[PDB]
Amino acid sequence: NNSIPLMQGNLPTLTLSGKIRVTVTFFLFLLSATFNASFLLKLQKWTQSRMKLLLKHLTLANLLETLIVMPLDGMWNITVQWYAGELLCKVLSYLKLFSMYAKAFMMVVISLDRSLAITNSKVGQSMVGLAWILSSVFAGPQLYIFRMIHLVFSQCVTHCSFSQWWHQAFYNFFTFSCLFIIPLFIMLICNAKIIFTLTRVLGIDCSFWNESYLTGSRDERKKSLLSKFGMDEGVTFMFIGRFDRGQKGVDVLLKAIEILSSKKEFQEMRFIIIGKGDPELEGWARSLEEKHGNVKVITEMLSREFVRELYGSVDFVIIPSYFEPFGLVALEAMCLGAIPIASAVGGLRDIITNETGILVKAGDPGELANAILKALELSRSDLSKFRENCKKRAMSFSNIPRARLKTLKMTVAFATSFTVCWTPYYVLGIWYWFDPEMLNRLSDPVNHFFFLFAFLNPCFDPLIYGYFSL
Ligand SMILES: COc1cccc(-c2c(C)n(Cc3c(F)cccc3C(F)(F)F)c(=O)n(C[C@H](NCCCC(=O)O)c3ccccc3)c2=O)c1F
Ligand SMILES: CCCCCCCCCCCC(=O)OC[C@H](O)CO
């Protein structure tokens, strides 16, 4: 009853505009074929690494899915009758699923290898072998379950092949998951990690944010700055952010300061808080600026050159944020030698280790107060190895080899192309599965369009490599 026309078209006859549309499909077939062909040749002529090893097998599955499904579904078997024989109906139904299982499992193997590469052997080729293995084993049943029926005219269908209704439901469910949904799952997850890396890497201009441009010794830099402002020398914490309520944490710091205000070791501490935003939060800071001469507040925005000034002079960066999935202030800061004190709320949770700063629970004014107190209790011993750890840790987060970087940006493009182009094709597939009478509500122009939109992905893959090839 509720099956899927995987090898059967839905046009009683061929309209003139149908013959126009098949010619237009022939175009996209030709763009795809000659391009993945000319990209395959580029690869062997460039063989006379592993990221090349995987692009060959992806492009090989691209060519294979283009040569099999574009003529089958787009040019030939588009009417409701099967014009070949029973043998070519079981072989072609096999090759159709085989070439699509293979294209997906290649995007899975690349998304998996590159997600690992952000942390030259045999494992490289055992992945793509498994990909061709699974995709050939998963398409096996299509040889037995498809048959040519002539009850009139002939068609290549699964009718009267499964017994119970559950035998067929689980088969088509298995086809959908292992064709699109499960790969999309594995892909989106692996490419989510690569997105975090790229954001950090392409987000720190290390050619600017580095300590080679500073002048002289670090404590000279601090004396000179602390009297530039107009306070005397002491342990220095700094905050630079938008004055926000429930967002960046300036209220937490301010209340933490007022806890630390009438205290025992408050006299040794300097605080430079910087930022503009809501107005009631500035009057709080600026009132602590008149009650205490070791609290400077700067709401005028500064120069790019003067932020690097401070990161490599202050003793600590207080980063009391509520939500910070990337953490670039902490990486600029650490790149210049400053020690971070931040709330474990995202990238700060991942960026600050045990020997690279002090993490605290977010949103608590106290506890931050005790962190600021722990930080000063460990300043009596001169922290030089402590600052080199942040310099090197933040260095790695912000820096990536050029070569491994283009393949990183490449993989994210491959995935987005697959996610974008194949999602409309396959949801109408699952939509049809739940309600077959949905087909009676869709154009021939839009059925044709979402067919072409899907095969934009495999013929633009070669374009994605070439683009990120400088
Ligand atoms: C496990 O399920 C699977 C597995 C693999 C592929 C398909 C698969 C998908 C996802 N779509 C997308 C699609 C629809 F489903 C329904 C409406 C519109 C579209 C559109 F996006 F194209 F607009 C296809 O069109 N075909 C083409 C398929 N006819 C095969 C013969 C060629 C033709 O029909 O001319 C078909 C047509 C209409 C309904 C169901 C199947 C597919 O085989 C599939 F359903
Ligand atoms: C847009 C269609 C496909 C998109 C694939 C995105 C993969 C999902 C991971 C999202 C991670 C994220 O933080 O997204 C934010 C990104 O900076 C958007 O500009």
Author numbering: 18 to 65, 74 to 144, 152 to 183, 192 to 242, 1001 to 1196, 257 to 328
Question: What does the original paper state about this entry?
Answer:
The central regulator of the HPG axis is gonadotrophin-releasing hormone (GnRH), a decapeptide neurohormone produced by mammalian hypothalamus neurons. The GnRH peptide can activate the GnRH receptor through the heterotrimeric Gq protein pathway. There are two isoforms of the GnRH peptide in humans, GnRH-I and GnRH-II, and their effects are exerted by activation of the classical GnRH1 receptor (GnRH1R), which belongs to the rhodopsin G protein-coupled receptor (GPCR) family. GnRH1R is expressed primarily on pituitary gonadotrope cells but also on lymphocytes and breast, ovary, and prostate cells, and has emerged as a promising therapeutic target for the treatment of conditions including infertility, uterine fibroids, endometriosis, and prostate cancer.
In this study, we report the crystal structure of human GnRH1R in complex with the antagonist drug elagolix. For lipidic cubic phase (LCP) crystallization, an initial GnRH1R construct was generated by replacing the third intracellular loop (ICL3; amino acids [aa] 243–256) with the thermostable Pyrococcus abysi glycogen synthase (PGS) domain22. To further improve the homogeneity of the receptor, the point mutation P1283.39K (Ballesteros–Weinstein numbering used in superscript) was incorporated into the engineered construct and the position 3.39 mutants were previously shown to make receptors stable in an inactive state, and were also reported in other recently elucidated GPCR structures. Finally, GnRH1R (P1283.39K)-PGS was crystallized using the LCP method in the presence of elagolix and the structure was successfully determined at 2.8 Å resolution. The overall architecture of full-length GnRH1R consists of seven canonical transmembrane (TM) helices but lacks a cytoplasmic C-terminal helix (helix 8). In summary, the GnRH1R crystallized in complex with the antagonist drug elagolix represents an inactive conformation with respect to G protein coupling. In contrast to the previously reported structures of β-branch class A GPCRs, one interesting feature of GnRH1R on the extracellular side is that the N-terminal region (aa 18–33) before TM1 is well folded and inserted into the orthosteric binding cavity with clear electron density in the structure. The overall pocket in GnRH1R is defined by the N terminus, TM2, TM3, TM5, TM6, and TM7, forming a highly hydrophobic binding site. The pyrimidine ring, as the core of the ligand elagolix, sits above the aromatic side chain of Y2836.51 and forms a hydrophobic π–π interaction with each other. However, the oxygen atom at position 4 is engaged in binding with the side chains of residues K1213.32 and D982.61, forming only a polar interaction network in the elagolix binding site.
